[PDB]
Amino acid sequence: TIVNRIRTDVVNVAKSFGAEYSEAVIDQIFQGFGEKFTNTGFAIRVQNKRNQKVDCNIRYGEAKENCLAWDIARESGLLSDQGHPVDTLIQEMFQAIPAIAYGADFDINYGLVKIWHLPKIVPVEEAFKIPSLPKSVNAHIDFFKKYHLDALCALTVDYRNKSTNLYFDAHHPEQRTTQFYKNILQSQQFEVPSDEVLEILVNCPEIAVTFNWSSPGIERMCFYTAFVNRETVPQHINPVLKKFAQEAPALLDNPGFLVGWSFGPDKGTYIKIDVDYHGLVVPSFFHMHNLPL
Ligand SMILES: [C-]#[N+][C@@H]1[C@@H]2c3c[nH]c4cccc(c34)C(C)(C)[C@H]2CC[C@]1(C)C=C
Ligand SMILES: CC(C)=CCSP(=O)(O)OP(=O)(O)O
């Protein structure tokens, strides 16, 4: 079956990359969501957040108007009460902004980590009326304006990290210059990457900003870049990129990949890479940012 092939590929990724994982957690996740993984925008992610350690997440999105993952996880026990503002945040999001898609993210050592909300691109102001958002979000209004973070294309709730992300379509011409990325990173006293990386960031169609309930500042931000196949991934920049690009499983022979370039105070600076397991994620990314496939 597809679902068994997916589960096998996921375990094999975790073994090959030495990622921590729990067979019992994988069982919970697949009992809840394995069918969803066979039928929708599924991806396997590795990232190198922690020191000399790769973590593995599995994720999916589908074009439903309602947050089916929240219902499945609550009914399944994969999502329990947190005693925290995250408890209702997803619900608020779907009540406050119409959704054209949803998705969910799972750490295979843990369980459900995040749920997300994909509306049509709307002005970021529509987020400020979500009650349970951390206060730092509405406090960054002038920040969003200045850096052309006006076109909100997604929201995520991170139940494990106790954080939320706002995602922006990076449509503005200034976001086509490297000085934009040096500026936006410097404004938070984040690490500035090499010139080559910056030359990669100028093409990014999507910028994520992470807020939390423990500081008034931005926790991290992330720049997403898609690549149509294994070869066009900048494999020379980091060994995890090379290895995952060359060895990641998919139901296609030469699948595409989504690379997130994350930046923070220094931790927060690292790479994430997702394999387009079914071939749907990358055309979705381009289409959702009004770009030719
Ligand atoms: C395209 N797409 C959306 C997501 C997405 C947006 N940006 C990303 C950067 C990195 C990774 C992903 C995404 C994932 C794999 C989570 C995508 C899954 C399909 C979505 C939900 C559309 C139906
Ligand atoms: C990008 C779409 C909205 C869902 C992906 S959630 P993410 O990978 O950006 O979340 P992290 O900040 O990396 O934990």
Curated annotation (Swiss-Prot):
Gene: ambP3
Top-level lineage group: Bacteria
Transferase among keywords: yes
Transmembrane segment boundaries: none
Reactions catalysed: hapalindole G + dimethylallyl diphosphate = ambiguine A + diphosphate; hapalindole U + dimethylallyl diphosphate + H(+) = ambiguine H + diphosphate
Domain remark text: Hapalindole A and hapalindole U are fixed in the same hydrophobic binding pocket, but they adopt completely different orientations, which define reverse or normal prenylation.
Designated name of the protein: Hapalindole dimethylallyltransferase
Gene source species: Fischerella ambigua (strain UTEX 1903)
InterPro entries the UniProt entry points to: Aro_prenylTrfase, Prenyltransferase_CloQ, PrenylTrfase-like_sf
Residues binding dimethylallyl diphosphate, per UniProt: 45, 59, 114, 165, 167, 220, 224, 272
The family this protein is said to belong to: Belongs to the aromatic prenyltransferase family.
Major enzyme class: transferase
Record's keyword annotation contains Transferase: yes
Keywords: Prenyltransferase, Transferase
Gene Ontology MF term list: prenyltransferase activity
